[PDB]
């Protein structure tokens, strides 16, 4: 069980009033995440209750409770004697503007004023700002660089307003949480089609836009590209591929790819595979395509685990 699940069980088992009181001491993101997780709860078993309660007790003893509300206590002490969460939120927004993809952030801030872009990048990590600037056009990127070189500081109010606007934009994006609609999704769809319709769609997209089809082609693994994969990954792949499946799949493979597979096998196994290829009769194209699809699925599984580099 994740910590979110344990927290959800704890909130469900303490009563509605207590859970509501706890929500008053949690941030908006945490409350939203817990409410979303509480929505999908269908059953809580005996272990999921007892272990969660014991872990909650051990955690309450871990930091020994205490920690009176910092904001109210600090305000009362300052008032009686005589930043804070706003500074923490600005720091979090600085963190939020570094974990995103460089392309997404660049597109988000592409239309902003060059001084605004420079101000944002100053507070960002060096690598993230470097990647974002690499995606801008020459003129805008160099203008932002020059403005950074002469950055004179920003008043806290303007920085806070910019942070609030960026937080609103991020909230809108997260509410959208745009489902993958780029060339990668189409390539995944295209890879699972039959060869006929796959090639027809690729050719038609190239007819409409050669660049778009090439982008989809670059994002798809339609077999016959294992020749460009390193020898170590191919050797790792051969340990998970059945000999008969490899034999059937390599029947329709090009001689370069066939030699690429043979070079990564043991010499005895390579000779056996060559003899089987020379002796086995014609194989229906559908079976070869199915075997190649299975090999591609194995390749994807290995790549997801980090054992294979594509």
């Amino acid at each position: 069980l994740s910590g979110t699940d344990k927290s959800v069980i704890l909130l469900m088992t303490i009563g509605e009033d207590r859970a509501a009181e706890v929500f008053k001491h949690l941030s908006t993101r945490e409350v939203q995440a817990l409410s979303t997780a509480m929505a999908n709860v269908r059953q809580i078993s005996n272990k999921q209750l007892t272990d969660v309660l014991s872990e909650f007790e051990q955690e309450a003893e871990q930091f020994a409770a205490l920690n009176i509300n910092a904001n109210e206590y600090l305000r009362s002490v300052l008032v009686k004697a005589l930043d804070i969460l706003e500074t923490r939120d600005t720091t979090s927004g600085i963190e939020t503007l570094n974990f995103m993809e460089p392309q997404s952030a660049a597109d988000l801030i592409r239309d902003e004023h060059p001084q605004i872009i420079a101000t944002i990048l100053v507070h960002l990590k060096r690598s993230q700002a470097a990647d974002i600037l690499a995606l801008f056009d020459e003129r805008l990127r160099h203008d932002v660089m020059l403005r950074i070189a002469t950055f004179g500081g920003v008043q806290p109010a303007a920085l806070a307003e910019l942070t609030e606007v960026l937080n609103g934009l991020l909230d809108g994006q997260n509410l959208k949480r745009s489902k993958m609609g780029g060339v990668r999704t189409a390539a995944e769809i295209i890879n699972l089609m039959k060869t006929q319709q796959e090639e027809a769609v690729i050719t038609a997209v190239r007819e409409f836009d050669g660049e778009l089809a090439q982008k989809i082609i670059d994002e798809m693994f339609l077999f016959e590209n294992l020749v460009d994969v390193d020898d170590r990954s191919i050797q790792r792949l051969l340990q998970e591929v059945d000999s008969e499946s490899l034999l059937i799949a390599l029947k329709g493979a090009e001689p370069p790819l066939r030699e690429k597979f043979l070079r990564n096998m043991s010499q005895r196994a390579a000779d056996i595979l060559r003899d089987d290829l020379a002796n086995r009769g014609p194989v229906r194209l559908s079976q070869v395509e199915n075997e190649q699809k299975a090999i591609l699925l194995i390749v994807r599984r290995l790549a997801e685990t980090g054992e294979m580099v594509i």
Partner: peptide, 27 residues
């Protein structure tokens, strides 16, 4: 369901919030 449920119900809501925050951070 021993007295631990009742004992946990009497804990400060801030303590529960901090435990929840730590659990979510550990994810």
């Amino acid at each position: 369901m021993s007295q631990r449920i009742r004992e946990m119900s009497d804990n400060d809501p801030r303590v529960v919030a901090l435990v929840i925050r730590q659990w979510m951070s550990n994810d």
